[PDB]
């Protein structure tokens, strides 16, 4: 999850299986023009 210049971007990935040792990439899936102030999440 990233939020820059008033835009909210969400990248995601799924896979089958402490975190495992391996290499994988993530693809862009959401961009929204929210444009608010975000500091804490749940």
């Amino acid at each position: 999850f990233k939020n820059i210049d008033g835009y909210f971007k969400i990248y995601s990935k799924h896979t089958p299986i402490d975190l495992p040792q391996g290499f994988s990439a993530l693809e862009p899936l959401v961009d929204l023009p929210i444009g608010i102030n975000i500091t804490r999440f749940q």
Binding site: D5, G6, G35, I36, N37
Partner: protein, 48 residues
């Protein structure tokens, strides 16, 4: 692009219009492409 034009005959009333409001006080400067709609009074002193 930025476009500006005149709307005198569409937003002027003899008795005066007060539907349009602006903000004058804030604690910190505004981030680009940001919208705030708060109403809390500007804390200039200690007592709320």
């Amino acid at each position: 692009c930025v476009i500006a034009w005149n709307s005198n005959k569409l937003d002027s009333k003899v008795s005066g219009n007060y539907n349009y409001l602006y903000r004058l006080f804030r604690k910190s400067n505004l981030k680009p492409f940001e919208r705030d709609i708060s109403t809390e009074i500007y804390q200039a002193g200690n007592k709320p």
